[PDB]
Every structure is written in C-alpha cells, then in structure tokens.
C-alpha cells in the first residue's frame, strides 16, 4: 500500500494544477487518457498541447499518450486504449504502465 500509495501521490503531485485531471486511484482516474498526457506534458511539454485535450475523447487521449510515450520516450505500449477506456479498467495493468513512466522520468 506504501509503493502504490507513493506512486499515486507522485502522480498527483506531478500533475498538480492540470485541468480535468483528477487522480484518486489507478483505474477510473486514468480511463479518459488525460492523466497519462498530463504526466508526459509535465516532463515534455514539447510533446503535447494539453490544452487541446478533452476528457470526452478517451480513445484519442489514450492513443496519444501511448504513441508518444512509445515513439519519443521508448516506453513500451503496454496498454491498449480500447481496453483502458472501459468503465473499470484493470488496476494492475495501469499501475505496471504508470510505473514505467515513474522510472523513466525519475531516472534520467
């Protein structure tokens, strides 16, 4: 609960101030793709025009973050947008992927 909890705070803290981002867990807080994009932007505002993103376009948002992370950060696309954009996405999946982001931005 410690590693998960610190991971959650980390995400919360990194995305302080992002509109339409509200991280309260590792499931539904990520299902619209905003949080993922906020994480990226925070580290590489050059890759995303966050202001253009709307919570409504889950697919787009998720593909966006996933494709950019893969393409520009070499972070493997472990998740699938369609799988993530459901009502109750798989927590473990998300956490695993979110961890790869944590390491990446934390190291380097």
Q: What is the C-alpha to C-alpha distance for residues 106 and 100, in angstroms, rounded to an integer?
A: 10
Experimental method for this entry? X-ray
Helix (H, G, I), strand (E, B) or coil at 40: helix
Task: Please report the domains of the chain, with CATH numbers, ordered by start residue.
Answer: 1-108 (1.10.418.10)
Q: What is the C-alpha to C-alpha distance for residues 36 and 79, in angstroms, rounded to an integer?
A: 11
Task: Kindly state the DSSP code that residue 50 receives in the 8-state scheme.
Answer: G
């Amino acid at each position: 609960k410690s590693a998960k909890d610190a991971l959650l705070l980390w995400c919360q803290m990194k995305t302080a101030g992002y509109p339409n981002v509200n991280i309260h867990n590792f499931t539904t807080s990520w299902r619209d793709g905003m949080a993922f994009n906020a994480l990226i932007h925070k580290h590489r505002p050059d890759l995303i025009d966050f202001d253009k993103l709307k919570k409504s376009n889950a697919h787009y948002n998720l593909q966006n973050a996933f494709n950019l992370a893969e393409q520009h950060l070499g972070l493997t696309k472990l998740l699938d947008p369609e799988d993530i954009s459901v009502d109750h996405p798989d927590e473990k999946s998300i956490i695993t992927y979110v961890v790869t982001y944590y390491h990446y931005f934390s190291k380097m």
